[PDB]
């Protein structure tokens, strides 16, 4: 559990990344994979599961490989009926069986068991997010989930998705914010955060970024606290 908060000279600065924040934008703007009661159909490497998940929308994929931190986590979820929710990328994505193209996408984590994970009533405790702009708490909004034990990733995607649209969190060129991290605070005081900005240099490696989600970290939707901490660029 508990991991400190960000050190100043540690956080990523958008002015140090120089290769289309749009490429970072693609991952959170109305972009994700959602599966309702799927069981692993196959596996490429020891730590991943391949689900036969079709593109409910415009069919860009029929196979989703999601990687987990290791084989012990993969063991635990293979055989299980699961609801899936993550962010995908095609870029540097896999090579399954050699025995069967149009419809191969990748993910990290995003697995939740279907049995006992939904509320008796609708989208419950639909989680509140406190946003901080230059230390000040300026806006607060609610994202909603339907699972009692949801992945940190799901709340992250929905959080950023809102931030992109109403706060222009990410532009296609660069970003109005220099730094930013999303901090999750659990009922027990467990604290853990993710950096929202890309590593320095031109290009952005999507798979290396999303990789932080492979631990398959879940939280409780009734009790989790989320605060995102941004900072503006000067002019
Ligand atoms: Zn379900």
UniProtKB/Swiss-Prot annotation:
Protein's UniProt keywords contain Isomerase: no
InterPro entries per UniProt: Enterotoxin, Staph/Strept_toxin_CS, Staph_tox_OB, SuperAg_toxin_C, Superantigen_bac, Toxin_b-grasp_Staph/Strep, Toxin_bac
GO MF annotation terms: metal ion binding; toxin activity
Function as written in the Swiss-Prot or TrEMBL entry: Staphylococcal enterotoxin that activates the host immune system by binding as unprocessed molecules to major histocompatibility (MHC) complex class II and T-cell receptor (TCR) molecules. In turn, this ternary complex activates a large number of T-lymphocytes initiating a systemic release of pro-inflammatory cytokines. Also causes the intoxication staphylococcal food poisoning syndrome.
Official protein name in the record: Enterotoxin type C-2
Stated consequence of mutating residue 114 to A: Complete loss of emetic activity
PROSITE patterns attached to this UniProt entry: STAPH_STREP_TOXIN_1, STAPH_STREP_TOXIN_2
Superkingdom in the source lineage: Bacteria
UniProt subcellular location: Secreted
SS bond partners: 93-106
A Pfam family of this chain: Stap_Strp_tox_C
Residues involved in Zn(2+) 2 binding: 47, 71, 80, 115
Manner of cofactor binding, per the entry note: Possesses two zinc-binding sites. The zinc ion is necessary for the toxin interaction with MHC class II.
Organism whose genome encodes this protein: Staphylococcus aureus
Keywords assigned: Disulfide bond, Enterotoxin, Metal-binding, Secreted, Signal, Superantigen, Toxin, Virulence, Zinc
Gene Ontology cellular-component annotations: extracellular region
Amino acids binding Zn(2+) 1: 9, 83, 114, 118
Quaternary data: Interacts with host MHC class II molecules composed of alpha/HLA-DRA and beta/HLA-DRB1 chains.
Family: Belongs to the staphylococcal/streptococcal toxin family.
Cofactor: Zn(2+)
Aminoacyl-tRNA synthetase is among the record's keywords: no
